[PDB]
């Protein structure tokens, strides 16, 4: 059931790339660093904090 967190994260990063927010590089380095931190996890609630942070990111911008 924790592969669903990874597939939702990779389809949201696929959304967030074509929103064209790559040029502001300072948030983009942190977002790709936390995406790399998502895929190498073993506990769920820490990963749940990571994905609700990424949903806060993709509901934050109006791109």
């Amino acid at each position: 059931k924790m592969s669903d967190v990874k597939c939702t994260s990779v389809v949201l990063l696929s959304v967030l790339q074509q929103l064209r927010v790559e040029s502001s590089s300072k948030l983009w380095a942190q977002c790709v660093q936390l995406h790399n931190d998502i895929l190498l996890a073993k506990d769920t609630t820490e990963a749940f904090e990571k994905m609700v942070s990424l949903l806060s990111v993709l509901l934050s911008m109006q791109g």
Binding site: M2, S3, V10, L13, E22, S25, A29, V32, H35
Partner: protein, 832 residues
Amino acid sequence: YRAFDIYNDKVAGFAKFLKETIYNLLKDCPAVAKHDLTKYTMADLVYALRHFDEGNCDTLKEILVTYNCCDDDYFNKKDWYDFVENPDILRVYANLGERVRQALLKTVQFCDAMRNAGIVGVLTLDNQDLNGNWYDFGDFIQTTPGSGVPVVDSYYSLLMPILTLTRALTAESHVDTDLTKPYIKWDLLKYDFTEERLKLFDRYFKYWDQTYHPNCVNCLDDRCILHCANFNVLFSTVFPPTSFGPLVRKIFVDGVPFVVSTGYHFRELGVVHNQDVNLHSSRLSFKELLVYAADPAMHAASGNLLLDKRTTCFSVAALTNNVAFQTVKPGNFNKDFYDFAVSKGFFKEGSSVELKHFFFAQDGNAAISDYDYYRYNLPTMCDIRQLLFVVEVVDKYFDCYDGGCINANQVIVNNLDKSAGFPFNKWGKARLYYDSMSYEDQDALFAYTKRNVIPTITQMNLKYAISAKNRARTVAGVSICSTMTNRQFHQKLLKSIAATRGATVVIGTSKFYGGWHNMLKTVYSDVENPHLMGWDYPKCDRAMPNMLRIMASLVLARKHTTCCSLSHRFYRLANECAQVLSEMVMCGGSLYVKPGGTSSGDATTAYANSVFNICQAVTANVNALLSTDGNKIADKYVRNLQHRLYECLYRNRDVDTDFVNEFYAYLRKHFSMMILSDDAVVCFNSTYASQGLVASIKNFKSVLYYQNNVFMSEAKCWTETDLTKGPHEFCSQHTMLVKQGDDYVYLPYPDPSRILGAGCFVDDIVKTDGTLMIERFVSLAIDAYPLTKHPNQEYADVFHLYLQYIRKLHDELNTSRYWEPEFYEAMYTPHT
């Protein structure tokens, strides 16, 4: 227990053991401590950096903590002794080298005082003090004064691969040999460096036997070249790194001054000058037009000077004013495959029904940081008689072929949809650059690149691939002209190796149609008690010595004895060393310089990696064979092999064919191999590797430590303890034994998470049409057949999931029909 170098009639080698009145002739020389020290000798410092293992590395530890180079509290830190993860270990090694210079100059004052005295005798490396004194005499002989000879081959030859690690000649860059004094200052415009380099060689290495030539075009065979270049690695760290490379010349045409090369000043291959030179051009010819357009001297003068502090490398210029960085795209998710993949009762928790591998994404500054991975390259320079024996043993693994020069009428292209290379890659592809000239022009450019040297420019950009580790690897890309000479100069042997079925080198031949049973029957050929090995080299593309690359290039052109003379081979070797070893490589709009190693885009790359793997294999067997005691091994033939081996290295000057054939017979019979460019399985006799007649894990650990300077962990290597089941990993495949028909056939099967991971992560949204995925999914079904016979049920569930999804895609859009297993079992029938 210390280390000793022994040349007796009984036992010869370099291993651990259990342990006159000529003094009144040499009593007034400042090199001999007076007779009746330091406790640790110099040869133990030679030995422990050549024979390194963790757990018995205590002697290196008191040798470093004795001489105030380090305290004892840096060593309770975890992970201290590796170059690849501790980059600060090279500083505490670097404090040793002034004692090494005080050793060598004291030997010069020993030898010059010996030759005037009249003593004929042979020098041994274990007799040195660490301060510089020599003390052990007792086997010399008297002669006429001013005519005594030294024999200095063994000391200097075994001393070579630690001088460039400990940086013993970094103190020649001062003013008058004191560290506190300032550095020596040159005029910038010097490019010769001949007279003072020669007096440096007759200061430090004055009594060496064979004549060193500071240039290599004067040289007379194909074995003075390795001699002169192996000395020239060590001497090329003193001189400042501005004054190395291409040169300029002023020429007038069309009322416009130009600039063009006339010769090169290499790190290794000396000084070569162009035999063709013109003062003025009257017209334009297309050969010289390609010569002029291939040169980046036309690009280097029209650029701004660059000072980079991101990396630790040297730079020349930036070609444009504007610097930009690019990003690695992430991938796409197939939700239809996952949506039907949960409908077959799959993807639970509480088990291993999950996924491992994923795509990864990298930032804008990943590319220049991936160039920064060349900082593990070091100046390394190797043994000289050991490499002279290795270069003749490796000839008999490859003298089963036919090869030679060709013409332009009999060249075979594979594809014509490629890239071209800088600066040609803005107008035409490779097909336009074969459509331009004729056959006579390609004969002329073969004849003219045996008379002149050309520079090129390496283009670099990124690639996208599936990984299990968050990392990027980019590409290397070589321009047209050196490759277009390279096809004519090498392509006969390139096709002659890749069309013979069954040999040591296993490239070309195929795993299908019962090929894998022939593979593993050739592995288990004549051995008696077999186990299996296997390893992967840690970042082999990013770090390699330059002597091993040049000696790998010279082996691959022994075959041209009926077409070309020596100078034509010299210009081909000079163009090869100028285009694969030290080329001004570009990384993102800025012209850098490459320190050395293989580019990953040349034509002769993978075969050079195969003969490179053969080179560490045969150096590991000779290093394991020399470093054991002669008073334990039972077989008399092994003992006579040991003594004639050590005599054939360090006491003979020509070649001996009979011992090369006998050593090739031994290494064929008891260390049978199978190598495809990085990855090997070998088949050792397990009665001997506990005794110590052949290599093991630990000898490969030691030889990769001292000659390549990259650590290899114990977790990556492995050893399989069964004859029946095969290798654990071999080119990322797994091996079992399957009953099929009336006998047993080796069916190789992949990782299951690779098969589950290759389908749901596609790299293109346009690829979600099924027109490519029908042959992609049936090729993956061919690749995932041998999970069916496995006794664990979940891989058969994966196989049936793929079968039902193939049936679903065939509904949405026996023997010859692929939707039944009768087609896929016909693929692994051994009869075609």
